[PDB]
UniProtKB/Swiss-Prot annotation, chains A, B, C, D:
Name of the gene encoding the protein in the UniProt record: sor
Enzyme class label: oxidoreductase
Principal subcellular localisation of the protein: cytoplasm
Regulation: Inhibited by zinc.
UniProt cross-references to InterPro entries, sorted A to Z: Dimeric_a/b-barrel, S_Oase_red
Keywords associated with the record: Cytoplasm, Iron, Metal-binding, Oxidoreductase
Cofactors required: Fe cation
Gene3D superfamilies linked: 3.30.70.100
Localisation per UniProt entry: Cytoplasm
Mutation effect (residue 103 to A/S): 10% residual activity
Highest taxon of source: Archaea
Protein name in UniProt: Sulfur oxygenase/reductase
Pfam families registered for this protein in UniProt: SOR (PF07682)
Coiled-coil annotated spans: none
Length: 307, 307, 307, 307
């Protein structure tokens, strides 16, 4: 079934020490998150660049990693029910806060953790290049050759277009209808590895370290080994939902060229351009497209998805 | 009277070519904006850093200019009526678009131009250190020594704390009441040069280059000398107003030390801390504090303000 | 169905500034071209070298990119009707001229834009290495395993042999019959990714910036933002068709070795050599074979082709 | 059928001279070992690193080859009957001792050669990337598409997780039952190339150069060309079997990322974590996971296995 998605976003210094801590602390946080039975997996990204759209963002390029002073992370965790995410944070707060806090020395902005519902998904299981023979054999054995997926390689071996949109109030239905039509056509592009549309339902105050006054002082004053009061979060997830309504259009690609020209198909192929124009007409903000590397992930989230 | 404020926000490459552009094109844009009789002035900032709040943002510091790969700009323009801003953009579109487009090669994100109403202002006219003798003389001559302001030096000779907040729906009144009480007490801190609270009323689609499909294609396809259709903006300013409600608390300081310890007075002076706690209890997001240098400005906006 | 092909040809300085231009302005031109409903896609090439034919062109090699002072581009655009190309240029002239002019500082020769009909095509859809599993699955599911194509990777991941020929007047039929027989045999060579034969039908004056006196002066005098009179083209497409008749034999290969020995099969395999000799007997000029890299492309042109 | 496994373990200096003698002497030893008809193949590994488990072993990493002063080898030989291994050593003692002894100048610890029974195996034949087409063709021809394996590339083109465990006396059955359930679920992880569980049955004294007094002196005094008395081994294989019972859980993976996250599936996927917890409850020691490169191998051992 479709899980809910929490996306933890932060910006940190782009230096070895940051990546070292990703390596020590990242796995620990994931292991703690997996204590909750509603956790169905995760997909953690580093932003490697920004789509320049010709020279609309002429200062950007798809891979800015060598020049950038910062690194942005977008950590997706997948949940049977979004409430599971909220419960997991609270039940495991002692561990999670202390692990999370340890990132402090490297932090510039964040964390900020909106929660999303998936309103459309066409996402395959991941497979390594070694797996495809057995996958093919099994699907033919089952008489289901249509269920043979593209090869979407895990652990940093493909790229993601993370396309931010906000929509004019009243035009949400038009946006949703048009974007699905667009993605249904986009799947013809070479190197297309899947797409999903995430619709924001709220924000996790606890995941964003956004407390009332009491918790704020506890965070600022923390030596690293004392929890802020997790009950001092002043708002529920839905209370923080944005209007204009925000969406992420998440599309995966074999490589950055396939991403650039593939995403470009909505601009270059007249038939698809006419359809995508209906999306553009609904926007307050966007599309702004971040190029992401899905480096660390729990690929079994797609197994839950495709049940 | 209180003007409305448009704040054009963008992120560009941090290199000499960007600053050279600022120098050529910036004055031109400012001169075009001044064609409209509702324009009452401007104050343009570059972000120099981020308040680390101890080590809450341990990777940040108040001056990151030597290390940062990007530069963020926040260009305030002040208007008798916010509709004047919208009219100015449309009446001068051929000049403004072509001037603003020229920044393309350096752009990473933006432009994004929210519009604000000022709900509280305690902001003096600017004066250079050469001016104070005459100011004092004139105020005593008029029998108004209470109207002698602090010396708030123009053109990059002071600093700004730009404090972002978003508020839980239903708590806007509590936020506004408490933040005013806070700023009324904060003005006792050494080196305090004034404060104002900006409340978002919407976003200028035209100023943010956010059009429907037609204009989007015109922007992407532009050689630099052809206007997108300014009538292709699909939303009015108020239609883009965010909920949760966004505010900027803008506070000016003699220098970054006065800023750090002065803003810190809300955390360190028990009496003020109790008051500021009432602000904290209302937040969905923030406070996140950007440190800005007001480099280029039309100081007469404060003359309009203090009429 | 078979589209018509316009091929815009130019020679430019081989330096970073040229490639930077390609990156900014290229996408813009492609997006403008896609405004016309007769546009079915594009395939843009840089020449990387020349086939030396042993030492017939002993000064050449298949990859001369490191040593060459110039770069030649051959930009294919595909059209339902060749008249669509002509209409598109005129309907979008203000954008296209200003975009294309911007390449001026780098130009040495061109542009020159002949138009071709496709008289033979055996060209597959492009696929990335990630796609083949799903392609295979779908073709078997449909009971069409014969329709499984070779893997022709898009975006610079294969090479093109661009073979120029001109034919003795009266021998066009002999050339066309023989070249088709040749290509039907050539498809047996390892790494063969497809072939088509293009027959010139004329030249686009407007695409070649070839005007009467009025437009010539407008071009030479242009500051970059004023269109030459697009009605000042003095000849129709067919009026410029060359005699001796010109053809391009366009053959795609997995890599430059497969190209060299594959194209070489017409010289080394006695059975095929005898057939290809019939082609050779008809020539005024050629074969001269340019080695091209198809870097930027709208792969959906092959979807139109293979309908 | 399932062969028995002897694993010869040693630690040597990490320098070119060591690898040079691997190259000269290794093939010779294998050729001698292959004189015995019970020999069914071999798989020789170098340890490249250690799984850090987050920062549990924070000084380790999966590839420590550039920094390590030593190299550990784990040489698996496979036998129809473990007694065949013992007979082979004795029948070929003059060759084997003199060959093995030549490694002396590089040795730091070892050799030590435990013997194992295989209690669970899910291990495919190896294939190179060139082989898969014919394997697929043959399996479909035989009507056995289920028997198409993953591509497990030989000769250092995949990696091994070598997971050491010792079990609380009395909990062997619980361990064995739970580990099999774990591995049956683990096979779903991307890049999984197979797994087996080895249960120690004893230690080869002769393979470990562990003699009584007489042989010990002969080893220490050896010029290199005189055999110690092979009849001076004072214990039989089973007499050296350890309690707590030792197991190796041997799991093969496409690459070190697939290994890290795949092995990690037992910690990150709640369903599998619950199962693997039953393994963890039985342990005296472990899991300690060595990362191995299977460099030199006789792949036909898997042909014997899968008969
Ligand atoms: Fe979270
Ligand atoms: Fe504006
Ligand atoms: Fe053209
Ligand atoms: Fe042995």
């Amino acid at each position: 079934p479709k899980p809910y998605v929490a996306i933890n976003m932060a910006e940190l210094k782009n230096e070895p020490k940051t990546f070292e801590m990703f390596a020590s602390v990242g796995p620990k946080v994931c292991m703690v998150t997996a204590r909750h039975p509603g956790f169905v997996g995760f997909q953690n990204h580093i932003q490697i660049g920004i789509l320049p759209f010709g020279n609309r963002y002429g200062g950007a390029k798809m891979d800015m990693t060598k020049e950038s002073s910062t690194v942005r992370v977008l950590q997706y965790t997948f949940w049977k029910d979004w409430k599971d995410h909220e419960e997991m944070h609270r039940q495991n707060w002692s561990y999670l806060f202390r692990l999370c806090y340890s990132c402090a020395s490297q932090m510039i902005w964040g964390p900020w953790e909106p929660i999303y519902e998936i309103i459309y998904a066409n996402m395959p299981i991941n497979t390594e290049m070694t797996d495809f023979t057995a996958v093919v054999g099994k699907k033919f054995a089952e008489g289901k050759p249509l269920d043979i997926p593209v090869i979407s390689q895990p652990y940093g071996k493909r790229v993601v277009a993370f396309a931010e949109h906000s929509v004019i109030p009243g035009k949400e239905k038009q946006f949703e209808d048009a974007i699905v039509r667009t993605l249904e056509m986009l799947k013809k592009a070479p190197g297309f590895l899947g797409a999903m549309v995430l619709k924001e339902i709220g924000v996790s105050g606890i995941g964003s370290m956004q407390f009332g006054a009491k918790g704020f002082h506890q965070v600022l004053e923390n030596p690293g080994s004392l929890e802020p009061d997790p009950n001092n979060v002043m708002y529920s997830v839905p209370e923080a939902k944005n209007t204009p309504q925000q969406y992420i259009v998440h599309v995966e690609w074999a490589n950055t060229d396939a991403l650039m020209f593939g995403m470009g198909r909505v601009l270059l192929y007249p038939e698809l351009r006419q359809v995508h124009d209906e999306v553009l007409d609904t926007l307050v903000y966007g599309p702004y497209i971040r190029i992401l590397n899905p480096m660390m992930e729990g690929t079994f989230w797609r197994e839950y998805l495709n049940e």
